[PDB]
Amino acid sequence: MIQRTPKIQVYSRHPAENGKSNFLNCYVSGFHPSDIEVDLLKNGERIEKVEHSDLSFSKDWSFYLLYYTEFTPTEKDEYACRVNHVTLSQPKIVKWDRDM
């Protein structure tokens, strides 16, 4: 079986500014097979209002998905994406960093 581990980027839709309704994205790509678990977290806790794109794939057959939710950045609140996949022994957590 081919198994390909996902790449993950966590980032906002628009430039990060406090008090303005922005969107938090978690882009997962380069993975096979297609079953994957993706959660967005606010202060370590799972956000419930999370939507995702329809499953598609690249030329090399690897899958990609965008997960997203409405959010408002602050000095205090921290954000992250938590990903689990068959290729991962433990869930991978990537922190949102407004500068990436």
């Binding site: 980027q9 096979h32 794109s53 329809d54 598609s56 794939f57 057959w61």
Partner: protein
Amino acid sequence: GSHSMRYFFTSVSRPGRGEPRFIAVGYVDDTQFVRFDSDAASQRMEPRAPWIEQEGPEYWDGETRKVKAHSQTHRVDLGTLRGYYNQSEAGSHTVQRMYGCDVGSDWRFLRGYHQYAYDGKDYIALKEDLRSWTAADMAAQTTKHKWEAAHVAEQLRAYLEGTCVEWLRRYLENGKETLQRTDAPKTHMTHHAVSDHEATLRCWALSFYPAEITLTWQRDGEDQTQDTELVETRPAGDGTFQKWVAVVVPSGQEQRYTCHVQHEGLPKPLTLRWE
């Protein structure tokens, strides 16, 4: 510029009970315009762009008919492939198909595609001439003989060279306000200091469409790839795309480095300097 239309289909078998999970999506360039999802309630091909909603109920009935036929084909495939590869009924497996056409600036046929994978590996693909097949292994060779005997390549070539391009031109016309508009990247540069002696410069390109773009660094007018990091182009979620490239530089030498941006929506390449 040049344009394309592509359809992507994934089916994933579900051991224990029921039919495969099937997901089909259609794209024009980097814009998704249709979807079907076996797990959704409507059991219809559904619009995903405003400009496809112009199409009548007969479009939707015909697309629904064909997408359901595609999913049954894939259902049968998953069983046949299990047998070809001597696999058990315990495991989940995947089939993927992609097809479509490319057109140049004149909207005339350039290239057509039809390719197939099993468990994420190359299985069979239509060659550029749309007359012959590339079969990866002996199972795919058996499929190649089946498809040759049934003249699959001839049917596909007619679709790809004619129907595919005809409807592409239709969609580009109907959706011209977005589909024929280019969004040039909005660019800026950030500075971060890792230490007393080292700095990171990051060059951003945001809100661009189509997705294709080139971002690079030069040092004193020469290409610099060493000590640079380039991220994968990523969807903003509003139909546009984002990318950055970063370089690590000696602190104080920032002015030597420039970022260069090539995109369809820019009449001339963009140059940025740290100010």
